[PDB]
Design an enzyme around this catalytic site. Structure first.
Site, PDB file in Angstrom:
ATOM      1  N   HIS A 157      42.245  35.004  43.120  1.00  0.00           N
ATOM      2  CA  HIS A 157      41.718  33.911  42.287  1.00  0.00           C
ATOM      3  C   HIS A 157      41.458  34.292  40.824  1.00  0.00           C
ATOM      4  CE1 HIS A 157      37.424  35.030  42.173  1.00  0.00           C
ATOM      5  NE2 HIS A 157      37.480  35.270  43.472  1.00  0.00           N
ATOM      6  N   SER A 215      33.760  39.401  40.865  1.00  0.00           N
ATOM      7  CA  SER A 215      34.800  39.357  41.891  1.00  0.00           C
ATOM      8  C   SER A 215      35.643  40.588  41.706  1.00  0.00           C
ATOM      9  CB  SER A 215      35.698  38.121  41.796  1.00  0.00           C
ATOM     10  OG  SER A 215      34.985  36.922  42.043  1.00  0.00           O
ATOM     11  N   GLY A 261      31.787  36.993  37.542  1.00  0.00           N
ATOM     12  CA  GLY A 261      32.563  38.024  36.891  1.00  0.00           C
ATOM     13  C   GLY A 261      32.541  39.318  37.668  1.00  0.00           C
ATOM     14  N   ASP A 264      42.790  36.608  49.740  1.00  0.00           N
ATOM     15  CA  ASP A 264      42.419  36.541  48.320  1.00  0.00           C
ATOM     16  C   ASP A 264      42.431  37.926  47.712  1.00  0.00           C
ATOM     17  OD1 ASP A 264      41.719  35.248  45.878  1.00  0.00           O
ATOM     18  OD2 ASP A 264      39.597  35.358  46.334  1.00  0.00           O
TER      19      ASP A 264
HETATM   20  N1  LIG Z   1      39.585  33.692  52.315  1.00  0.00           N
HETATM   21  C1  LIG Z   1      40.256  32.387  52.077  1.00  0.00           C
HETATM   22  C2  LIG Z   1      40.413  32.074  50.610  1.00  0.00           C
HETATM   23  C3  LIG Z   1      41.423  32.672  49.863  1.00  0.00           C
HETATM   24  C4  LIG Z   1      41.554  32.405  48.515  1.00  0.00           C
HETATM   25  C5  LIG Z   1      40.716  31.489  47.901  1.00  0.00           C
HETATM   26  O1  LIG Z   1      40.831  31.263  46.546  1.00  0.00           O
HETATM   27  C6  LIG Z   1      40.332  30.134  45.940  1.00  0.00           C
HETATM   28  C7  LIG Z   1      40.473  28.891  46.538  1.00  0.00           C
HETATM   29  C8  LIG Z   1      39.950  27.769  45.928  1.00  0.00           C
HETATM   30  C9  LIG Z   1      39.243  27.889  44.747  1.00  0.00           C
HETATM   31  C10 LIG Z   1      39.067  29.130  44.168  1.00  0.00           C
HETATM   32  C11 LIG Z   1      39.599  30.251  44.766  1.00  0.00           C
HETATM   33  C12 LIG Z   1      39.680  30.918  48.627  1.00  0.00           C
HETATM   34  C13 LIG Z   1      39.542  31.192  49.972  1.00  0.00           C
END
Ligand SMILES: [NH3+]Cc1ccc(Oc2ccccc2)cc1
Ligand SMILES: [NH3+]Cc1ccc(Oc2ccccc2)cc1
Lengths: 642, 645
Positions: free
Chosen positions: B55, B137, B135, B79
């Site tokens: 993300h 992450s 910030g 992610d």
């Molecule tokens: N672990 C599952 C997962 C994987 C990626 C993810 O990214 C995002 C999704 C939506 C908004 C912001 C970030 C969210 C949940």
């Protein structure tokens, strides 16, 4: 009228140009889109000068063909800045016979109809989200003929929906251009035949609150000198007896003295504590450090401006080394060095060499008391003699003689009067920022923010006093000076109730005196809003007010009044942090949802909104609220055509 | 365990480095403070790979000694992305025996104790506002021995306070490394003996909606082909019956046809309208456009994955040109050309020169209907035959045909199937985000944002088909594909209620099948929260529901519900925007503050939060919400203590 935008610079050039200050691209159009590192907004050219708002532009130079253009005009009282227009800039021309139908050019090239009400006020025919207008400060309000009625500066909003616009009329520019671009304010004013507020801009050392008051008293005048700091107020008493053979009166909360003398030194705090002006007491009132934006200075200076024409005084003097819109300039006594990354001690991302602070007396500023104690440990760990100082601690922790590193927050400024061989500045300060979040009411958040130019100059000016100084910094930036947040007003009312038995309507009159005097720090006009919310905060619990004053964190009155309501509903507090310790003794007794009036921190509880006061406050939120909407760089432009 | 930070680059050194993708500064430390143009976050170097969250980082390269370092690993489901650490860089290493005491390192170099509570969750011993963790992450959770337990990806919140943290367990990272960097997915799968969900990633051209369903039919199997577009569905059918010989069943709202054939084509909407999978019906189901994140495609695929095995299917193919993670590589057939300032027609900051479009067939994309109209008017001044198309308008308002310059929104890409000589892209689109603003409940804002890779690829995809094609664009670069907002889930429940007579609990199940299937677009998991909200929205007014449904606008069930409560309070709506037109009729009789349930737009009337429904939704807000909290450039580092705490 019709309009379309043209992007001329992208991120890399904007940054490169900001630093070099050399804009080599040819300024076409008459409305420009400008950027700083943080904000983006609009600048209009009228009568050969390129104008924009102070809250966006600051004291910043304009990137130009031959390097940085410094501002030609700076009216902080009218949120106006202006640079001489680079050769080949078209200009709008003023509006002689104003219409009432106006057209507001936004930064998206949308042209918005507006109905003119005041000199500087217009109502949007179709109300819009305030978000829509943000980015358009310094965009021009036009008449149909294409001429220029003024430049946009604030939205006036109901519950987050812009319904009116605030602009700078074009005549205020004509006034501004006509005003002396340089005026002399270093020498003290002569005592006029009748009332007059006067300014004194002189660096620290000019005897602003020693030499000059001594002068006035030798001319036979009775003189009150107001000051924020107790340490300072007290220190003059002694210096005076010595260097001018007057034992003056001293008035501080801790300790007062009444010698009968013609000169009195007093804290703003104590000044307010004694019901302001006593009629007949003083001819001259000198308000020192009026660049100060703490609630007590503001309220105090307000009071003096409100009362002194009546108390017999003939001269108020607003004295300061750093008036609103002033730039932190080279000091001939202070070498300024950037902290780098090769040192033994981590400090805000940079490092400090242990060489730099072993032996001698040094001052390291930190934004937060946490970080002070942390650093004061590290240093004592390394055998350096370190000492933390911040709000709470007594000033005797700072040895008045002998090697030491004092790790301090800004409390140090009003708490301790000594100077230092060097100062190391993290270049950031904590600040309080009110947000009209409607969840349910308003919120007051803390925030680490870049230091403004006044702060940098107070901090750096603790070295270099008649002897040489090093000033080490993490970062070269200033934010622009002489603007304060609405929460400072909020604090004034809180203070008014907490400490000085002022009804919110009397606090308003004094703040309104402050706001309507030119040459002071500025503030969005939210006097009525805050007055109304405090008006409703009735039948507070004295005993809770007590403990929040005692503990002396901010907003003692709001913190007490939540505390109160919580108790009149066996209802727990937002959370169990320090703030609501004045309830710990009832912790196992209270249960349910918190009847929340406003957010002064993290809320960790169920919250009910159904309390009558909460509702009163939410109704207070329906008030009209004026909101605002390295070199400055031209990133684009808006081209005009009905 | 204690930490401190070093800023290793300024703001300019960082832009220079993102663009050149070359970074010389030795990579010291383990925790890296990395940055994009848009944001900043942490990256932790573990087992020689430098990990961070998808993300934050998308598919972007990572500046390095010799040039941009390509991502080695990308797991949009976890992610999680990873580059190879430049040789030198220290690495943390995994924990060797689960101690539950944990330590999160924040970008402010604070170290904040966490209690492990399951495979990838830990609770803060001290709750703290989420804004404190922003910030951070990609930062590590360490065990007391200073070893990597996982990289932090999101906070679990109650009303804006983090009580718990979600992380990517370092074992997931261990799997990833002990596994292939390159996978196939390019070819249609053979049908398995029992149920299997296969992926199929192939260019539009691979005939994955026509060629491959034929193949499976040629092998004597019943295959259903779901597609989001109704134009795409009718067109694939037509092409099939003609250039392929089989008259295929079509199932769409505008046109249903039962031949009896072994191939059926359908949209997701009709499928959902038909109740999904009817037992025995099909063996293979191909979900083309699985990358779509319209509520209907998400609900549809959810149903297929929820129902397909019990309905006796043997193979679900999730089919797409551009899976989550995919990047926009160039084309053999499409020259791409930076729009610029010198030009007769202003276009999103730059200009379009007329010569570029005076003759032939051209698609100009625009973020909104307003800009389409406005730009149409301008082009019919300079006398080019130019229509505007968008949601609402009819597909055949376009010549098939003559000379034309079509000015479209993304609505084009479902309504119309034709292609063009050149496509001009403003490179921005309109999203909806949900903000949990507690003012009193939540907000759905419609914003304009940079386009993602899929978008760019679809929009550019409307040229260069079996010929030359020019691609003109206002801005290079994309944000990352494969992520959608919590609002899209909201839309799913809303459609459930509005359109498909699905109760919320039923919808949860479909969507939960979507979420737990990997290789699809990912999503903050807010299933229970929305399920709860819509459960409480009972006794809606059928007549308002049918007008909002007809109207075509978004969140038909929420708009109509808000209208229901108002009508029955004799209160006005929160504004007199087009959204509330279904109450205009009644305007004389509506007096007072509106009983506000949520925000879908500008509230202008006074509001009042005493309605039982407001309170119910307000209570739902106390749910546990997971909130996320040129090359990537290292701008700094957090140093960890080597001994002591
Ligand atoms: N672990 C599952 C997962 C994987 C990626 C993810 O990214 C995002 C999704 C939506 C908004 C912001 C970030 C969210 C949940
Ligand atoms: N963010 C605080 C802030 C922002 C803008 C501002 O401008 C003004 C206000 C009043 C008069 C003149 C100029 C004052 C304070």
């Amino acid at each position: 009228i019709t309009a379309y935008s043209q992007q001329t610079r992208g991120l890399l050039g904007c940054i490169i140009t900001s630093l070099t200050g050399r804009d080599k691209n040819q300024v076409e159009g008459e409305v420009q889109v400008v950027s700083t590192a943080t904000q983006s907004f609009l600048a209009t050219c009228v009568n050969g000068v390129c104008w924009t708002v102070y809250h966006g532009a600051g004291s910043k130079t304009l990137a130009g063909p031959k390097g940085p253009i410094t501002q030609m005009y700076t009216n902080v009282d009218q949120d106006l800045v202006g640079w001489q227009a680079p050769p080949g800039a078209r200009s709008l021309t003023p509006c002689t016979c104003g219409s009432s139908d106006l057209y507001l050019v936004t930064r998206h090239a949308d042209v918005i109809p507006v109905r003119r009400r005041g000199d500087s006020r217009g109502s949007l025919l179709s109300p819009r989200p305030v978000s829509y207008l943000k980015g358009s400060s310094g965009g021009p309000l036009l008449c149909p003929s294409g001429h220029a009625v003024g430049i946009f500066r604030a939205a006036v909003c109901t519950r987050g929906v812009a319904k009116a616009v605030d602009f700078v009329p074009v005549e205020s520019m004509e006034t501004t251009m006509r005003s002396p671009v340089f005026t002399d304010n270093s020498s003290p004013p002569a005592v006029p035949q009748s009332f007059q507020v006067a300014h004194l801009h002189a660096p620290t050392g000019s005897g602003k609150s020693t030499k000059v008051p001594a002068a006035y008293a030798a001319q036979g005048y009775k003189v009150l000198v107001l000051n924020p700091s107790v340490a300072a107020t007290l220190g003059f008493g002694a210096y005076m007896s010595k260097a001018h053979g007057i034992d003056p009166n001293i008035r501080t909360g801790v300790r007062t003295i009444t010698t009968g003398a013609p000169v009195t030194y007093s804290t703003y705090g104590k000044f307010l504590a004694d019901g302001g002006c006593s009629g007949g007491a003083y001819d001259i009132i000198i308000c020192d450090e009026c660049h100060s934006t703490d609630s007590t200075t503001i309220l105090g200076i307000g009071t003096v401006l409100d009362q002194a024409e009546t108390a017999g005084a003939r001269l108020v003097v607003l004295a300061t080394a750093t008036p609103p819109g002033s730039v932190t300039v080279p000091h001939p006594n202070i070498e300024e060095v950037a902290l780098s990354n090769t040192g033994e001690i981590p400090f805000y991302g940079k490092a400090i060499p242990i060489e730099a602070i072993r032996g001698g007396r040094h001052l390291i500023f930190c934004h937060s008391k946490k970080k002070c104690d942390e650093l004061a440990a590290k240093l004592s760990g390394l055998g350096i003699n370190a000492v933390a100082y911040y709000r709470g601690l007594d000033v005797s922790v700072i040895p008045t003689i002998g090697d030491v590193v004092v790790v301090a927050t800004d409390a140090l400024m009003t708490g301790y009067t000594g100077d230092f061989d060097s100062v190391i500045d993290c270049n950031t300060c904590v600040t309080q920022t009110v947000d009209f979040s409607l969840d349910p009411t308003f919120t007051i958040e803390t925030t680490t923010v870049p230091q403004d130019a006044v702060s940098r100059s107070q901090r750096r000016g603790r070295t270099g006093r008649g002897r040489r100084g090093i000033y080490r910094f993490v970062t070269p930036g200033e934010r622009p000076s002489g603007m304060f947040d609405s929460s400072v007003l909020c604090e004034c009312y809180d203070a008014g109730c907490a400490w000085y038995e002022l009804t919110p309507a009397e606090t308003s009159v004094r703040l309104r005196a402050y706001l309507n005097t030119p040459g002071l720090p500025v503030c969005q006009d939210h006097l009525e809003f805050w007055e109304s919310v405090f008006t409703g905060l009735t039948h507070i619990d004295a005993h809770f007010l007590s403990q929040t004053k005692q503990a002396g964190d901010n907003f003692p009155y709001l913190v007490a009044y939540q505390a109160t309501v919580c108790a009149r509903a066996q209802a727990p507090p937002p959370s169990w942090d320090q703030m609501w310790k004045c309830l710990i003794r009832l912790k196992p007794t209270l249960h349910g949802p918190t009847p929340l009036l406003y957010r002064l921190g993290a809320v960790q509880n169920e919250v009910t909104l159904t309390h009558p006061i909460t509702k009163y406050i939410m109704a207070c939120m329906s008030a009209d609220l004026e909101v605002v909407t390295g070199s400055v760089v031209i990133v684009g432009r808006i081209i005009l055509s009905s």
